[PDB]
Design a protein around this ligand. Structure first.
Ligand code: CHD
Ligand code: CHD
Ligand code: CHD
Ligand code: CHD
Ligand code: CHD
Ligand code: CHD
Ligand code: FES
Ligand code: FES
Ligand code: CL
Ligand code: CL
Ligand code: CL
Ligand code: CL
Ligand code: CL
Ligand code: CL
Lengths: 359, 359
């Protein structure tokens, strides 16, 4: 029987193969929400072309592409199986992938969900911690889709816009941290320093009121409480690019700083994403752990395994959707408050799109 | 009978009268753990002399001085009464006030504690969230004291260096927030926006690895969870001074930003301090709530009552000391990890001072 409930899994996405790099960058540079560039329609295609080689090279170093779709698909399948058993009344559940900058695009997904004639659609962001640059961007895409297509939705919409402290998400993180701690030499386990690492944000974004830093911090505290503060930690930020100021400490400088100060046993913990991608396989594993860590003289540096295919994570996803359905919530209370210094007109339209949904 | 256990309540402190402002500023501009200035011993006296008038005016605007000692004293008395009944084994308990920049100074308190022949001394920071600029500075002063007095402690030392999520602290904040929400016109209660406000930190400090932001963020989440996300919120930062970059968003700009965007019912919540002081009585209440507020036409802006004399907060203090004593902890696990980019030699000696304590 036809699907009744569609769960739209939102993520930025990553190029699956080296050939997809260029268009990935192009869609990025054309996103007005994310960037404001002079003669953007001409620069974007250009900057995309110029940066493609370097980014293709990064992906080549990790196998030739991003595994995000594979992991998202696996998580989505496991989620659905559980949902059908957890919430029979919401008939067959079907997951859809809505990537922001690669296929399948958010728009392509919405089109399919509508074609499937679903009764309800749930915008389920895959970023546990809300950032206007990530989840916000994905939600704006949904609102903009219908606004641009000049048609109203044929399905009842709602969103799970954030879930920084979901108990099962926390357990997965804690479990992966513990098993990785077991991989360190036993004589240095207690000496191990935990560096939670999350993608950074330009200070200009943080200073406008972005909810991200605070939520990421919340996730870290929850994980450490569950670990009973077994090891000391610090929350640091990676992926900064450009000359502008970003939220620090930077993960690379922190790794180097710690080593130079005698803390040569480090456990990196990606805390703001649920699957492997360029951030973990290239930035953390290659440039920081193999090169930087090497030249600084670390003794042991490891990275907790990304959630990926952990069955407990699929359970978390299903639990979130199930609880969302039972509560009848259209969105979090947090989504009803835009950044104090928000200057993007769509943000308010997007929140209204969700808070105003029928039912 | 003579005191057996001494609880040193550490806080920066504030001038009790307008006449105390100058020496307050002088001691502050001379603190290395707080700042590094050229010919500091020469600049400090001068800068203090310069800023005194303006700072005296601020205190005059709130009644003529800081109420920190009054509240600290009251909380300390309540704490002791409870401790004598909670931990009979640790005989009579006595609290001592160790202000960093005003009398009684941390050094004077240590002198009196030694003098009283205590068997045990507990460095109890009154800042729930650890910053090397607050609690760290206070702990360094304890280490420096003995190192400068050329004598080893005659009593056992240990520290409660942080307590950002203590359940009773969280309950106090939630309680004060709820009762303040009751003071808003009923028709606007659910429209109320909560702005948690904490003293900011220069980005140079945040970027070195300061634990503060993440911990304050943890306090915010716990409070909101206890409030069941009844209202939307944002964590913002106040008290920025100077031309350098500080962690934002700024509380003042956020209040103004919210008002300009139609959110004219705001509840300010000081989340990083436990009693009234210049930050609440002057900054938030006068310049932000009285001036700025009407500048943009707010409908209702209120500030949750500081914890001050709340009996439940006294219980929180007592339970923290009780748990600390029973656990036999010398310090948090977190204190065993200095900032990844720490460049202050004393930090490590201070932590060792505590981790190496006999018992
Ligand atoms: C001025 C603008 C910054 C606007 C902002 O604060 O967002 C910046 C952002 C992207 C920049 C462009 C991109 O870095 C791509 C090009 C890089 C070349 O080295 C100079 C021209 C070049 C075409 C840049 C011109 C200018 O510095 C841009 C357009
Ligand atoms: C800074 C911004 C997040 C905050 C915001 O919205 O301004 C983030 C979101 C997507 C990021 C981009 C994407 O991850 C794609 C590229 C990845 C490369 O490793 C760096 C450049 C690269 C082009 C990134 C620049 C910057 O880190 C971006 C643009
Ligand atoms: C890394 C990439 C290309 C630089 C190059 O090779 O010339 C540049 C081009 C556009 C830049 C972005 C835009 O200037 C918009 C943002 C400006 C903010 O000050 C920093 C983040 C910000 C989101 C920039 C991140 C990064 O510097 C980008 C994404
Ligand atoms: C910036 C610093 C905290 C981080 C750091 O250690 O560098 C904080 C801690 C104590 C603060 C100072 C004290 O609160 C005393 C003064 C209070 C006045 O309202 C502003 C200047 C004033 C002189 C403050 C300047 C600055 O905000 C200080 C110096
Ligand atoms: C150069 C030094 C910055 C130290 C550093 O963080 O690297 C800064 C910090 C304190 C500054 C001083 C203080 O702000 C006090 C004075 C303020 C006057 O407006 C200029 C001279 C003045 C005497 C300043 C000179 C210089 O800008 C100082 C000395
Ligand atoms: C606001 C005050 C100026 C006093 C005056 O001359 O009027 C200045 C003088 C010394 C300054 C401090 C010192 O330069 C030391 C720190 C330098 C960091 O980059 C910012 C915080 C930092 C802690 C500064 C805060 C603020 O800019 C201070 C406290
Ligand atoms: S930029 Fe955050 S709500 Fe608009
Ligand atoms: S400045 Fe943080 S431990 Fe030294
Ligand atoms: Cl990727
Ligand atoms: Cl919420
Ligand atoms: Cl809003
Ligand atoms: Cl004060
Ligand atoms: Cl700890
Ligand atoms: Cl250390």
């Amino acid at each position: 029987r036809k699907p009744k409930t569609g769960i739209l899994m939102l993520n930025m996405g990553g190029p699956e193969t080296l050939g997809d790099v260029h268009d990935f960058l192009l869609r990025l540079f054309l996103d007005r929400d994310l960037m404001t560039l002079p003669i953007q329609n001409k620069l974007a295609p250009f900057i995309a072309k110029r940066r493609t080689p370097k980014i293709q090279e990064q992906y080549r170093r990790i196998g030739g592409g991003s595994p995000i779709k594979i992991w998202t698909s696996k998580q989505g399948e496991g989620m659905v199986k559980l949902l059908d058993e957890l919430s029979p009344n919401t008939a067959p559940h079907k997951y859809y992938i809505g990537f922001r900058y690669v296929h399948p695009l958010t728009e392509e997904a919405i089109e399919e969900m509508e074609r499937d004639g679903l009764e309800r659609a749930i915008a389920f962001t895959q970023y546990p911690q809300y950032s206007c640059s990530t989840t916000g961007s994905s939600l704006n895409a949904i609102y903009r889709y219908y606004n641009q297509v000049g048609r109203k939705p044929t399905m009842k919409w709602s969103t799970i816009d954030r879930w920084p402290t979901h108990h099962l998400l926390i357990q997965c993180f804690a479990d992966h941290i513990l098993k990785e701690l077991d991989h360190f030499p036993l004589e240095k386990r207690s000496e191990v320093v935990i560096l939670f690492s999350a993608h950074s944000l330009p200070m200009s974004v943080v200073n406008r009121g972005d909810p991200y830093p605070q939520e990421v911090s919340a996730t870290v505290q929850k994980v450490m409480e569950r670990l009973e503060y077994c090891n000391p930690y610090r929350l640091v930020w990676q992926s900064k690019v450009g000359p502008m100021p970003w939220l620090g400490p930077q993960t690379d400088e922190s790794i180097k700083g710690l080593c130079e100060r005698g803390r040569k046993n480090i456990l990196l913990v990606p805390i703001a994403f649920t699957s492997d991608h360029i951030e973990t396989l290239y930035e953390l594993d290659i440039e920081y752990s193999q090169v930087l860590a090497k030249e600084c003289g670390v003794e042991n540096i490891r990275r907790a395994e990304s959630l990926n295919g952990n069955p407990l994570f699929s359970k978390a996803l299903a639990d979130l959707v199930h609880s969302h359905i039972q509560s009848n919530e259209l969105c979090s209370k947090q989504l009803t408050l835009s950044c104090p210094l928000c200057v993007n007109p769509v943000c308010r339209e997007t929140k209204s799109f969700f808070t105003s949904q029928q039912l």
